[PDB]
Amino acid sequence: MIYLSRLLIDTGGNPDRPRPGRKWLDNIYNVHRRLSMAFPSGLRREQDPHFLKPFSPNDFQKTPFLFRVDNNIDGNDKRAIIIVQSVLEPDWDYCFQNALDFLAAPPETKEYNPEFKAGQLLRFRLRVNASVRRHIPEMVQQDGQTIETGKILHKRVSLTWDASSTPDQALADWLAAKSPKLGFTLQRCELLQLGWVYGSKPEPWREHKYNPLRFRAALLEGVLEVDDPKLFLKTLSSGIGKAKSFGFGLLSVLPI
Template sequence: MYLSMLKLNPRSRQVQAELRDPYQMHRTICKAFGVDKEAWKEARVLFRVDESNEGRMLRALVQSAIKPDWSRITAPDDYLLTEIQCKDVAPVFKAGQRLAFRLRANPTVKREGKREGIYGEMERLEWLNRKGEANGFFVQQARVISDGKQKGLTTRGCETVFSAAVFEGVLVVTDPDAFRAAFESGIGSAKGFGFGLLSVALVK
């Protein structure tokens, strides 16, 4: 697996446009893996934009199964503030391991065949607990540090609204194989819109 960090320029018009329509940022990022959509699928790209200092600092984290070639992306000179950093990551997961985590997700539930957003802190934490049970981890502690709605455009150009929540906390690995699969493929839906990337670090 590879993890890249892109420091985005919040004053860039393209960055601003992609924040309004995150799927366009997904398309920009995926160009680092070629122009073929099959190559995009093989790369299993996940990304998340983290903001700090009231949006004055933007960092896009990109996780992929294939090493990206960032020279392929087409973006104006003011798109990035610094050179892109990329490193090879090979985490080892063990049963009973405690990991600090951060996850930006799109909590949803299916009702009568339709996917609906989940709102409310308790309901979102319950959703996270269910995801843990299904993906080899137990949520020891968690909080929703940011929530709300995010608009975007589907591939057909239709406007859609996502339930956006950022979770932070500590989890315990219960099934290393299931957890690795979730770590590599992401948690929840709408991954092409910047959701699903699970970042973890050992709890000392």
């Protein structure tokens, strides 16, 4: 009995009109915060039922929520799509009661229920950031000449491939390697979005700071096969990759 709905964003029309939704999607933390507030704590509704106070996340409750940023249902209208799921009841009249300019159509929600079998075909779209934890030589200053010390910095490098390998079967081999651990097996998958995803974060007289959030996103699509139905119920609403809370874990439950 999972909670699947649709938020609908314009991303089009007259360029002269300032569209706050367009800058709302052009950052991770904005959509993250707005969908995180979309499950408010119950005592706030009893206290302020009108969404008319300076909020605080300590008053809010915390759940491993997750979304999906897509676009382009055609038919002579370019439009952008937000697909959200989590485990608690969301509210959309509470969330966007002052943000009617954010959307291009009123949101809609129905009841959806997923079922899985053994050795059954599926169709899926996932998004996982290309993340490989590596020891790197540090490279700072860069004032005319390179300067390094013996310290090896620890971070997650974006995925790279050898010069005799195209990106396509490299990410196919990544998905093939990650399949038997998570609980499925595929025969082929198609790469259709490899790119860079940028964002920024504020944090606590104090100031505010801007740092470029960095994620090597990978959105794929097409034809899934399963090995056991019991290895998929714990995958939905939790995520399979990294940047889990940032909207990188929705299992597209479309059996066809």
